[PDB]
Every structure is written in C-alpha cells, then in structure tokens.
Ligand SMILES: Cc1cc2c(cc1C)N(C[C@H](O)[C@H](O)[C@H](O)COP(=O)(O)OP(=O)(O)OC[C@H]1O[C@@H](n3cnc4c(N)ncnc43)[C@H](O)[C@@H]1O)c1[nH]c(=O)[nH]c(=O)c1N2
C-alpha cells in the first residue's frame with residue numbers, strides 16, 4: 001500500500017485531538033489529523049455541552065462566539081435529593097454548539113498548515129522495534145488503505161480507546177478502565193413549552209435513587225431549549241440508564257416538549273485519575289482515551305483541551321531533543337499532572353466517598369451547610385478540600401446521632417491531600433513509574449477499605 005511520512009499523526013479530532021492540532025500548528029512540524037466522522041459531524045459525541053470559562057482562560061483558548069455559543073452560563077444550582085435545599089454556585093461558562101466550535105478549532109488548525117482527513121479510521125498501529133511508529137489508515141472518501149509513519153502518534157480516540165487498545169498488552173499505555181471507574185451517561189436536547197426560569201443557570205440534581213453514582217442535569221441552551229440528562233456509575237449491576245431516564249424525566253424536566261426532541265444519545269464517561277502514564281515510546285494519549293475527565297462532576301471537554309496543550313508542549317520538546325522514547329515525551333506527564341492530573345487524583349478519592357453517601361446523608365449535609373458553596377467549588381476547581389474546611393464540617397457532623405459515612409469526611413480530606421502530594425511528586429523518568437504506580441494503588445486500596 002501507499003506509504004506517507006508525517007512528523008505527528010493525531011488520531012481523533014474531538015476537543016482533545018483538535019486542541020493538540022491547534023497547539024502544535026505553525027511550529028515547524030508536518031502534522032496529520034484523522035477522524036472517522038465526516039467533517040460536518042466531528043465533535044458530535046453526546047455531551048451536556050457545558051464548559052467553564054476558566055478552562056478556556058487557563059490555556060488562553062479563544063472563547064466560543066456567534067453560532068458556537070448557544071447560551072452564556074453564570075452559575076449552577078445544586079439540588080439536594082429531597083429538593084428542599086438549593087445551592088447557588090456562581091461562575092462563568094458556555095453552553096456550546098460543540099460540533100460548530102470543534103469544527104472551528106480544526107479549520108483554524110488547518111488554515112495554519114495542519115492536514116486533516118475526515119472519514120478516515122486508524123485501523124492498526126505500526127508497532128516496530130518496540131515503538132509506535134504510525135498507523136494503517138482507511139480513508140473511506142478515497143477507498144484507500146494507507147500506511148502513515150510518524151515520530152509521534154497522538155491517540156485522541158475518545159472513550160473507545162480504539163487505537164491504543166490494539167497495542168501489545170505489555171505496554172503501560174494500554175492501561176484499561178475498570179467498570180466502576182466510569183459512568184454511562186445519556187442526554188436529550190428538547191425545546192420547552194415555557195420559557196426557562198433562570199436560563200443562565202445550569203441545574204444539577206443529586207439523588208442516589210434516580211441517578212445512582214452520578215446525577216441528573218438540566219442545562220439550558222437558550223430561553224426555550226434544554227440539554228437534559230443523567231449519568232450513573234458503571235459496574236454496579238444497575239438497569240439500563242434509559243430506564244432511569246424514562247422513569248424520572250418528568251421530575252427534573254416537567255416543562256419539556258416531547259414532540260420537539262432535537263437530538264438524543266449516550267456514551268461512556270471515564271471518572272478517575274488519568275492514565276498512569278499518558279506517554280510511551282512513540283505515543284501520547286489524551287482526552288477521554290487517557291481518562292482526562294473530572295471524576296466528581298464528569299466534565300471532560302476543558303481537561304481534554306488541557307491534555308492537548310500538554311501533548312503539543314511535550315512533542316515540541318521531543319523534536320528539539322530528537323528523542324521520541326517515553327523519556328523523550330515524558331514532559332507530557334509532568335505538564336498534565338501539574339495542570340489537571342493531580343487534581344483528578346484527589347477528586348477520584350472524593351468521588352468514591354460521594355458515591356457511597358445515602359440520600360439522607362446528602363440532604364443533611366446540604367441542609368446543615370456542612371461545607372459552603374465556595375468550598376465545594378474549590379474541591380471541583382482545585383482538587384482541594386482543605387483540612388480546616390473538613391474540621392468545620394466534622395463539628396456539624398458530630399451532632400448527628402445515627403451511623404453515617406459522613407463521619408469519614410476528615411479521613412477523606414486527608415487521603416485527598418496525600419494522593420495529591422503523591423501526584424505532584426510524579427516520577428521524573430519512566431524507570432520510576434512502577435514504584436510510583438504501586439504507591440498510588442496502595443493509597444487507593446487503603447482508602448477503599450477505609451470506607452467500610
Ligand atoms: C452524555 C455525556 C455528557 C457529558 C459528557 C460526556 C457524556 C457521554 N462530558 C464529557 C465530554 O463530552 C468528553 O469528556 C469530551 O468530549 C472528550 O473529548 P475527546 O476529544 O477526548 O473525545 P471525543 O469522543 O469527543 O472525540 C474522539 C474522536 O475520535 C474519533 N475516532 C475514534 N476512534 C478513531 C479511529 N480509530 N480513527 C479515527 N478516528 C477515531 C471519533 O470519531 C471522535 O470524533 C462532558 N464534558 C464537559 O466538559 N461538559 C459536559 O457538559 C459534559 N457532559
């Protein structure tokens with residue numbers, strides 16, 4: 001078959017891959033990005049479509065504008081299971097037309113010299129002399145099977161991890177997802193019969209009964225249009241997510257016009273610390289494929305962008321040292337762990353605690369303001385549940401006279417602090433990965449057993 005040579009091959013053009021392509025562009029490298037979807041569909045994986053302004057500001061990424069921005073967001077209303085307590089957390093964000101925004105990023109990368117092939121699937125890794133060296137591609141548009149050699153593959157295939165999963169199982173880069181370390185999530189976008197009240201606020205409903213291990217949401221995309229959905233924890237033996245959706249839609253969105261459903265669909269959402277390494281010989285993994293999603297709230301588009309930025313920085317470094325080994329690309333890990341990954345680890349711990357609380361516990365915690373709105377935001381945005389905050393909460397939790405997981409909150413805050421420090425001491429070279437990964441697994445297993 002035809003053979004071509006590129007500096008970098010990016011597989012997948014979602015928020016992650018498009019960010020890597022945009023960040024890598026005009027820097028002296030010959031870059032190809034492929035995606036299985038046609039151009040007009042790239043970026044259309046089911047999603048709530050809500051992204052913090054802070055993630056854009058973190059990277060100085062351009063804001064969505066015009067048709068890309070469906071609705072400006074000014075905060076979130078968090079509802080207790082019993083619906084009796086509502087927290088308002090202020091904070092700026094965007095309700096996107098994700099395909100339009102994603103497609104703009106790709107088009108700008110393309111304008112800056114990135115080559116893009118839509119309707120093109122990476123089918124088989126080229127793995128030779130112990131390195132990823134490219135991919136066999138199938139271009140549906142030309143009916144051509146092609147070999148593309150690359151010094152670095154950026155694996156951005158989303159939740160399918162379709163390319164890295166084909167590599168030798170020996171490689172750290174083939175790390176799999178445990179069923180309990182992901183949610184399945186499902187959403188619909190519908191027009192509403194009435195104008196949406198406070199249409200600039202997202203609504204999140206916590207209820208361990210109607211969305212076990214996740215939550216329900218109501219994300220307005222305009223005055224009369226809403227993205228409504230839920231996520232539930234995987235690996236727990238729960239019934240189909242669409243059963244919960246059908247049963248409880250009316251509770252959360254009594255105002256939707258079912259005759260005006262616009263889109264619907266679901267997908268897997270990783271909810272854990274990132275891949276232990278996001279780099280190996282000839283390859284970096286980003287976005288959902290590298291488990292970059294916030295484990296507490298399930299937001300992954302901002303972290304996908306961050307991972308793409310770190311991949312760009314790492315790759316430029318590798319070309320400046322002629323070194324495409326894991327060691328040569330290792331800055332990917334250092335960059336990502338400092339920007340988001342250490343936070344994700346702390347939040348992976350926090351999520352495990354939250355998923356085991358009862359509705360009674362959550363009703364109590366929210367009613368009693370055991371932590372403040374701002375503290376919960378700090379946990380989300382920084383991965384930090386300060387020990388002083390945990391101490392204050394424990395003083396309130398001390399007044400409860402029934403058994404409750406809430407009594408472990410200080411212990412949870414301590415483990416969150418420990419794992420965060422462990423991640424910020426990420427190994428400086430691959431020869432220390434094993435030792436460190438064992439320390440992390442030990443922290444996690446200890447923590448898991450401390451919750452019973
Ligand atoms: C229902 C639901 C709701 C939400 C969310 C998820 C889900 C399922 N999330 C998560 C967020 O949607 C997700 O984390 C990011 O879109 C992931 O971006 P990626 O680029 O990693 O994957 P994404 O899946 O977007 O892109 C991967 C691309 O790779 C392509 N591909 C795969 N294999 C290939 C191959 N072998 N060859 C070529 N192409 C290949 C696919 O066609 C696809 O375009 C979220 N996050 C958030 O920030 N805000 C929110 O409101 C929500 N809500």
Ligand SMILES: CCCCCCCCCCCCCC
Nearest residue numbers: 048050214231296297298299
């Ligand atoms: C502002 C970003 C928040 C939107 C995230 C929506 C993600 C939906 C999936 C929820 C499942 C994760 C809960 C643990």
